Enzyme design. Sequence first.
Site, PDB file in Angstrom:
ATOM      1  N   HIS A 290      -2.189  16.837 -33.176  1.00  0.00           N
ATOM      2  CA  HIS A 290      -0.726  16.788 -33.313  1.00  0.00           C
ATOM      3  C   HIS A 290      -0.343  16.198 -34.656  1.00  0.00           C
ATOM      4  O   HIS A 290      -0.985  15.258 -35.105  1.00  0.00           O
ATOM      5  CB  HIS A 290      -0.081  15.901 -32.204  1.00  0.00           C
ATOM      6  CG  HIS A 290      -0.370  16.353 -30.816  1.00  0.00           C
ATOM      7  ND1 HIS A 290      -1.515  15.940 -30.144  1.00  0.00           N
ATOM      8  CD2 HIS A 290       0.343  17.160 -30.006  1.00  0.00           C
ATOM      9  CE1 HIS A 290      -1.474  16.536 -28.962  1.00  0.00           C
ATOM     10  NE2 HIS A 290      -0.367  17.271 -28.829  1.00  0.00           N
TER      11      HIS A 290
ATOM     12  N   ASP B 165       5.555  23.109 -31.150  1.00  0.00           N
ATOM     13  CA  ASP B 165       6.750  22.315 -31.467  1.00  0.00           C
ATOM     14  C   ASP B 165       7.920  23.183 -31.936  1.00  0.00           C
ATOM     15  O   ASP B 165       9.039  22.978 -31.462  1.00  0.00           O
ATOM     16  CB  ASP B 165       6.445  21.270 -32.580  1.00  0.00           C
ATOM     17  CG  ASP B 165       5.603  20.083 -32.152  1.00  0.00           C
ATOM     18  OD1 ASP B 165       5.451  19.873 -30.942  1.00  0.00           O
ATOM     19  OD2 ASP B 165       5.066  19.385 -33.039  1.00  0.00           O
TER      20      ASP B 165
ATOM     21  N   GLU C 210      -0.392  22.871 -32.363  1.00  0.00           N
ATOM     22  CA  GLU C 210       0.681  21.941 -31.970  1.00  0.00           C
ATOM     23  C   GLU C 210       1.993  22.158 -32.692  1.00  0.00           C
ATOM     24  O   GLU C 210       3.051  22.040 -32.068  1.00  0.00           O
ATOM     25  CB  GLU C 210       0.240  20.486 -32.154  1.00  0.00           C
ATOM     26  CG  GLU C 210      -0.951  20.113 -31.294  1.00  0.00           C
ATOM     27  CD  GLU C 210      -0.755  20.283 -29.808  1.00  0.00           C
ATOM     28  OE1 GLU C 210       0.393  20.125 -29.339  1.00  0.00           O
ATOM     29  OE2 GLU C 210      -1.755  20.551 -29.108  1.00  0.00           O
TER      30      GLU C 210
ATOM     31  N   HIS D   7       1.927  27.171 -26.058  1.00  0.00           N
ATOM     32  CA  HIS D   7       0.489  26.921 -26.178  1.00  0.00           C
ATOM     33  C   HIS D   7      -0.320  28.120 -25.692  1.00  0.00           C
ATOM     34  O   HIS D   7      -1.449  28.338 -26.139  1.00  0.00           O
ATOM     35  CB  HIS D   7       0.078  25.639 -25.449  1.00  0.00           C
ATOM     36  CG  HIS D   7       0.015  24.422 -26.327  1.00  0.00           C
ATOM     37  ND1 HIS D   7      -0.588  24.459 -27.568  1.00  0.00           N
ATOM     38  CD2 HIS D   7       0.436  23.159 -26.080  1.00  0.00           C
ATOM     39  CE1 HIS D   7      -0.456  23.243 -28.062  1.00  0.00           C
ATOM     40  NE2 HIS D   7       0.153  22.427 -27.197  1.00  0.00           N
TER      41      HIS D   7
ATOM     42  N   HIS E 278       7.143  23.985 -25.545  1.00  0.00           N
ATOM     43  CA  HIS E 278       5.891  23.568 -26.208  1.00  0.00           C
ATOM     44  C   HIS E 278       4.694  24.031 -25.362  1.00  0.00           C
ATOM     45  O   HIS E 278       3.788  24.681 -25.897  1.00  0.00           O
ATOM     46  CB  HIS E 278       5.875  22.037 -26.401  1.00  0.00           C
ATOM     47  CG  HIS E 278       4.677  21.492 -27.104  1.00  0.00           C
ATOM     48  ND1 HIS E 278       4.750  21.061 -28.407  1.00  0.00           N
ATOM     49  CD2 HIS E 278       3.425  21.281 -26.650  1.00  0.00           C
ATOM     50  CE1 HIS E 278       3.536  20.638 -28.719  1.00  0.00           C
ATOM     51  NE2 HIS E 278       2.711  20.743 -27.693  1.00  0.00           N
ATOM     52  N   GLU E 279       4.726  23.741 -24.032  1.00  0.00           N
ATOM     53  CA  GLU E 279       3.635  24.137 -23.118  1.00  0.00           C
ATOM     54  C   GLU E 279       3.489  25.636 -22.930  1.00  0.00           C
ATOM     55  O   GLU E 279       2.364  26.134 -22.977  1.00  0.00           O
ATOM     56  CB  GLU E 279       3.601  23.340 -21.795  1.00  0.00           C
ATOM     57  CG  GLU E 279       3.654  21.834 -21.992  1.00  0.00           C
ATOM     58  CD  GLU E 279       2.578  21.186 -22.850  1.00  0.00           C
ATOM     59  OE1 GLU E 279       1.459  21.739 -22.940  1.00  0.00           O
ATOM     60  OE2 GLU E 279       2.835  20.075 -23.368  1.00  0.00           O
TER      61      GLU E 279
ATOM     62  N   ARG F  80       6.547  15.799 -36.993  1.00  0.00           N
ATOM     63  CA  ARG F  80       6.858  16.798 -35.960  1.00  0.00           C
ATOM     64  C   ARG F  80       8.364  17.025 -36.019  1.00  0.00           C
ATOM     65  O   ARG F  80       8.791  18.145 -35.856  1.00  0.00           O
ATOM     66  CB  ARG F  80       6.433  16.362 -34.538  1.00  0.00           C
ATOM     67  CG  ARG F  80       4.931  16.148 -34.388  1.00  0.00           C
ATOM     68  CD  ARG F  80       4.568  15.561 -33.036  1.00  0.00           C
ATOM     69  NE  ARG F  80       4.580  16.597 -32.011  1.00  0.00           N
ATOM     70  CZ  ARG F  80       3.878  16.570 -30.889  1.00  0.00           C
ATOM     71  NH1 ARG F  80       3.089  15.540 -30.614  1.00  0.00           N
ATOM     72  NH2 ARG F  80       3.997  17.547 -30.006  1.00  0.00           N
TER      73      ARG F  80
HETATM   74  C1  LIG Z   1      -3.422  16.739 -24.218  1.00  0.00           C
HETATM   75  C2  LIG Z   1      -2.210  17.103 -25.072  1.00  0.00           C
HETATM   76  C3  LIG Z   1      -0.880  16.940 -24.375  1.00  0.00           C
HETATM   77  C4  LIG Z   1       0.286  17.179 -25.279  1.00  0.00           C
HETATM   78  C5  LIG Z   1       1.670  16.842 -24.627  1.00  0.00           C
HETATM   79  C6  LIG Z   1       2.892  16.569 -25.560  1.00  0.00           C
HETATM   80  C7  LIG Z   1       2.435  15.568 -26.642  1.00  0.00           C
HETATM   81  O1  LIG Z   1       2.371  15.861 -27.838  1.00  0.00           O
HETATM   82  N1  LIG Z   1       2.169  14.367 -26.073  1.00  0.00           N
HETATM   83  C8  LIG Z   1       1.732  13.130 -26.701  1.00  0.00           C
HETATM   84  C9  LIG Z   1       2.960  12.488 -27.392  1.00  0.00           C
HETATM   85  C10 LIG Z   1       2.790  11.072 -27.981  1.00  0.00           C
HETATM   86  N2  LIG Z   1       2.001  10.056 -27.593  1.00  0.00           N
HETATM   87  C11 LIG Z   1       2.338   8.975 -28.581  1.00  0.00           C
HETATM   88  C12 LIG Z   1       3.277   9.501 -29.437  1.00  0.00           C
HETATM   89  C13 LIG Z   1       3.959   8.892 -30.638  1.00  0.00           C
HETATM   90  C14 LIG Z   1       3.690   7.554 -31.102  1.00  0.00           C
HETATM   91  C15 LIG Z   1       4.375   7.056 -32.250  1.00  0.00           C
HETATM   92  C16 LIG Z   1       5.298   7.900 -32.956  1.00  0.00           C
HETATM   93  C17 LIG Z   1       5.590   9.192 -32.532  1.00  0.00           C
HETATM   94  C18 LIG Z   1       4.918   9.684 -31.378  1.00  0.00           C
HETATM   95  O2  LIG Z   1       3.553  10.777 -29.052  1.00  0.00           O
HETATM   96  C19 LIG Z   1       0.502  13.501 -27.598  1.00  0.00           C
HETATM   97  O3  LIG Z   1      -0.614  13.667 -27.143  1.00  0.00           O
HETATM   98  O4  LIG Z   1       0.826  13.716 -28.887  1.00  0.00           O
HETATM   99  C20 LIG Z   1       3.550  17.826 -26.240  1.00  0.00           C
HETATM  100  C21 LIG Z   1       5.089  17.621 -26.306  1.00  0.00           C
HETATM  101  C22 LIG Z   1       5.342  16.270 -25.612  1.00  0.00           C
HETATM  102  C23 LIG Z   1       4.099  15.999 -24.734  1.00  0.00           C
HETATM  103  C24 LIG Z   1       0.375  18.649 -25.612  1.00  0.00           C
HETATM  104  O5  LIG Z   1       0.844  19.603 -25.001  1.00  0.00           O
HETATM  105  O6  LIG Z   1      -0.059  18.712 -26.806  1.00  0.00           O
HETATM  106 ZN   LIG Z   2       0.723  20.502 -27.467  1.00  0.00          ZN
END
Ligand SMILES: CCC[C@H](CC1(C(=O)N[C@H](Cc2ncc(-c3ccccc3)o2)C(=O)O)CCCC1)C(=O)O
Ligand SMILES: [Zn+2]
Lengths: 696, 696
Positions: free
Chosen positions: A658, A597, A593, A534, A530-531, A664
């Site tokens: 996201h 994914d 995003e 990006h 994923h990173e 996702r």
């Molecule tokens: C600044 C961006 C950082 C981000 C990091 C990652 C990410 O998506 N992190 C969180 C995940 C998160 N927090 C709450 C929930 C959630 C709650 C309920 C149901 C489902 C999920 O999921 C987010 O910001 O969405 C990419 C992959 C994993 C880490 C990026 O690279 O985009």
């Molecule tokens: Zn991301």
Amino acid sequence: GICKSSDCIKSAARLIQNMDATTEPCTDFFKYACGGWLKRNVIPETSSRYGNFDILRDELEVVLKDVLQEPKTEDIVAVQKAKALYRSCINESAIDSRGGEPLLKLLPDIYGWPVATENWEQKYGASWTAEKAIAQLNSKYGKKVLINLFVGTDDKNSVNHVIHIDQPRLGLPSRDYYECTGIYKEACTAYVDFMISVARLIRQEERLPIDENQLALEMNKVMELEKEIANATAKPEDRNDPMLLYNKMTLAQIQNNFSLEINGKPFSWLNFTNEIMSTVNISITNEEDVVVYAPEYLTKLKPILTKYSARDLQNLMSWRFIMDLVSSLSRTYKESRNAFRKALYGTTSETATWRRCANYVNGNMENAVGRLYVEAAFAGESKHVVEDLIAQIREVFIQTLDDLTWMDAETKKRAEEKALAIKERIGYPDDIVSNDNKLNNEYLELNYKEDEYFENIIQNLKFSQSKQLKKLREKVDKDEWISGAAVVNAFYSSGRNQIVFPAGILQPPFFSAQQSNSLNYGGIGMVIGHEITHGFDDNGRNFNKDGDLVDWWTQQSASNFKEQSQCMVYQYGNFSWDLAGGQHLNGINTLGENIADNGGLGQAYRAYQNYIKKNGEEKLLPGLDLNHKQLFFLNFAQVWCGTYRPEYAVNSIKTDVHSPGNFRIIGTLQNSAEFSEAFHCRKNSYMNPEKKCRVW
Amino acid sequence: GICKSSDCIKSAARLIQNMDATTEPCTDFFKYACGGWLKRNVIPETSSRYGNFDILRDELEVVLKDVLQEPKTEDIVAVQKAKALYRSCINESAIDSRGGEPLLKLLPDIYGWPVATENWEQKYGASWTAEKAIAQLNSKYGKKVLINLFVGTDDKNSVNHVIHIDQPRLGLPSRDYYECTGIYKEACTAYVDFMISVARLIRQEERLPIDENQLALEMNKVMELEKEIANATAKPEDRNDPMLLYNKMTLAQIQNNFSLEINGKPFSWLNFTNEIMSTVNISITNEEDVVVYAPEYLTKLKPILTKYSARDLQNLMSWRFIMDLVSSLSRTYKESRNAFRKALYGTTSETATWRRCANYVNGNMENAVGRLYVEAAFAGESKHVVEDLIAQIREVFIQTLDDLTWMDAETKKRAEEKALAIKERIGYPDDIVSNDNKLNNEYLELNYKEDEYFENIIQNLKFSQSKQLKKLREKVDKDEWISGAAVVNAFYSSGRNQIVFPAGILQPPFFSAQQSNSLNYGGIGMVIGHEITHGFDDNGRNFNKDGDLVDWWTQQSASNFKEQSQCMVYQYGNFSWDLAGGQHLNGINTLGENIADNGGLGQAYRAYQNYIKKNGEEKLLPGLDLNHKQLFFLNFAQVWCGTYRPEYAVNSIKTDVHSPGNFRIIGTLQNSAEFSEAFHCRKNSYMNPEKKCRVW
Ligand SMILES: CCC[C@H](CC1(C(=O)N[C@H](Cc2ncc(-c3ccccc3)o2)C(=O)O)CCCC1)C(=O)O
Ligand SMILES: [Zn+2]
Ligand SMILES: CCC[C@H](CC1(C(=O)N[C@H](Cc2ncc(-c3ccccc3)o2)C(=O)O)CCCC1)C(=O)O
Ligand SMILES: [Zn+2]
């Protein structure tokens, strides 16, 4: 042929407890992977959403509380400061005693808040200047109102800093809210009522007469103003092309091309910038180079601002800062925020004081707190294993370039260049543990009083703002980490071409050197992918190996990128979110995003396939009638177990880039042939559509 | 030779995650069994204590919310009422709208609250009679003040009901608090401040002038009064002999032996009783038989009450009822309770509204809610397995009688009689599911309005009080269950000679027909043993096979019981509780429970030993380097995983008859030779003292 280790039985129980075997994996993989979890759990009163990520975050707060609450004899000055900041934050008796007094003392410094001040025009209006008033909030408090002027990395030169000019953030989650109807009605009502409530608390404390009608007249004029500023702001969809957003101008051409008449003046861009930069004793000339991200917003602003007085603008300007301070004052002030946060977040309560404080000190002293976290919670032998997984995933990203029919050899060679140059950061920077002076010097200018929480928060605002402003003539430090270690998340920086895996995300279900590799590749592997992806999404693809906004794509490969991506724009834009009231996802805003994914999981899977080729099959998990390929997808999906409050779902669809966790899972696995292969999905089953999107 | 079933891996993971292997089992078994759990967990802001029992209770509330929130087409009237009670409870908008209005309407019915009433003497004093004022609160609202008069089962005739007279409950957790110093200082300050706060809210709403000094003068006179009533009350240590507590008198001898002069009257015991009983149209004569539990309290009361006016007494009387209603009124009223509950419980917040409401409707409609719970959560094939475990444990209780050297053959034969006669209740009464009229008729007299929560709570008070008062001439119903099914607990009734295992406690870690028997015997087995042993503790031993308070012990066997027990009085009285501020446990108050814990675990272990003899060894658990005998003690100890808030620890040491969870583990296992055998404990190791207590 079954594993019976303690670490394998722990993971099999978690997988078993979270899943729902009564659901067909090919009908709904979110329900199958997460059904057991959704049934057992209710979102806490203090939470907007709940699930894997939020549970791990809650658990990380427990560790922070342990390390922050107890003074130790051999604690270095940097650690003493973190603990003293924590102790000042947790003493609500001391905070409550002061009422709104620390805010009363703050108001003359910001030209006051007209609604809670007698004779504002005589007191503040006389000296008042838009360029002085906006600058004061900006330089001393980091509060960007009307015009967002900041010092940041040059997108076109990653070693230097530049002054940027952009549209400001609004008091409500997004511009969308300003419609103030239906789904947004309660948020707008609670917003103006919150302005009114705070104004009334200040008047009462300052022994001023309270006219309820004039409070509503003045506060509705702030909403009227912010509704106009919100409509002037450009949509995120009109801000997703970094090349079109980048406009380099001199301060001379900004004064010529973007005139403003505030309080019938006009506005001096040079005075405004120098008013900000003098805070840091930096002189600015009209030959100063500025990156203007919001030229259309600046043009639209001109006929808006001529319509309002100094009094109307400052009423919004100070409210925007006051709305952020109220939660650092006494209970009475804290309570004035109740309906507004419930409307935005659905939460009926604030999180435990110790949790807010652990987070506050971690956010302001990330290296001091990260150091304490890693000693307590992180094993350094994990660092080495993660480094090796990254090397494997970067390799799979390069190998895959060859199989990509939609790119030409010339663009593929430059993508290889970008990937090879990606700088990885795993766990924590060694320096935070081994170098005491460095750690102590980073906080040298901070001096916290344990009975003075508000002064402590105000000191942090000025310090972080001085730190950022001083960077203008300075070069970008290559050794800087884009995140602290005590974080359950991972990141990518376009400007630094860097991937970060803080120690906080390097734990189950994502990673363990003792859990099965199917689980590691499906968890942290997907996250590494994923990173890396990006760096090659609709934004990242625009930056080279050095982090510079430069075109490295051939016209064809670039058009093909857009063509390949459009498929995901439609797929995700077609997902209807029940929690957001049947509303569709923004397929354009979530694109970056969604690419990350889909690419990320495919890259992780191929690395897992290469792992098997080299090392043979893994011992099967007890209690699961799933092979390891299936466990790979089960674990990836369990990373996203979660649910949202309706109000927060209405917020996130508009503000978050996201897709929600469930989509996702569904979106990614719909495009994965390897998934349908592993779960023997029938053609055109919900999880197996004929048309499969693919970019990376 | 290892089990790999889904249900065995789930239990092994829970055991593994909760334990701490780095701790020596023979140094501290609580730390070894629970260390992992204590490290990962923090008590929630809304919880006084947290652990296995509270987690299961929280999870049971989730199920209640599911079954109560959604109306269904085929819902019987009884179910519709439960759901409509729930919906009225969860609408805080409707509740908030009403302010303290439903309480304002209530006050004239109770002779008012003098502190929040103008000219109370002219308005209420003129008609006022202690016997009318006390009776009103008692019969209509179930609120027992000054004199606790109730209709309950005759201890000396288990088929009939009798009028009982006892000392009342106090506003603070125990009589101990009334010292108002050190550990109790904050509770006493917050109690009087809570009286003052509510009095001020009522005056403000009734548009009355507020004199802060006269509020403090009147409210301190209520504390002054309750401090005297508290000192007059007998200690629990002076109430633990059911034979000495039982005093049968006629209303004539009560009037002759316990005179009272209230408002310079004197008090008419006949008028008081008839004032209560007429509510239910029952006539009482001076030849009425009454069980007087607090004769010394009634004697001490006489010189207390002559000292105070009608105004002083009613100020306490109405406060005692008002302090219970405040949480059913608007936010403003709810908030007045903040410091008082924090001082008693340490909680900084109220539990989620939906949780309080699910609990409220479950407590008031136990059969309607139990029915919904069992359909959703309980498998009927568990009922049969539990019945069989009970039969095995009852058998082991009888077998053990022979090995008991401290009892004679004659007392042993009567203990066999009592045990054989024990009536077991498993899961739920069939009738709640299969008989719709019966279920509907039990709530026939209740009619709930969805916008009228306070009226709904008031209706429930009057109904439950009428139900209890009407039982006087009625016989005790043999088919009545002492608990609803949606309860995570087990019980024993002395009067009914009955053991109850609601469906709520028949789940892991206590029981599962799919988890190992070592775990079942160590969990639910121990709990079955605990309930059977209650029939033979320092209280239960005084009741025969029919539930009658009759001596069935020989002088010697009775003296031996006391001798054998005294060992546990010393053992537990010697435990110092760090959370209660280093304070020692009450070895006398916790005796009954400690006997039950020690007997219960020994009986469960012997039944598990008999299970092995008959069926052979069980397949070992994966990831655990423990045999099944060790897992038996690991599971028993995990039932008690938990911690307490300091304020609640200060409360429970005084009010709870159970030792805290950690000491129930340490105390029981210290006396268990089988434990030290299973864990190969060295002589005189903390877990293995030479002197081992034993009664059952
Ligand atoms: C600044 C961006 C950082 C981000 C990091 C990652 C990410 O998506 N992190 C969180 C995940 C998160 N927090 C709450 C929930 C959630 C709650 C309920 C149901 C489902 C999920 O999921 C987010 O910001 O969405 C990419 C992959 C994993 C880490 C990026 O690279 O985009
Ligand atoms: Zn991301
Ligand atoms: C009316 C009496 C019913 C009682 C039932 C049993 C019991 O003791 N139940 C609960 C157990 C409880 N709740 C919270 C905690 C706890 C919290 C933190 C740490 C440790 C423990 O433990 C209790 O009332 O103590 C006997 C055996 C199990 C069921 C009885 O027979 O005495
Ligand atoms: Zn008990």
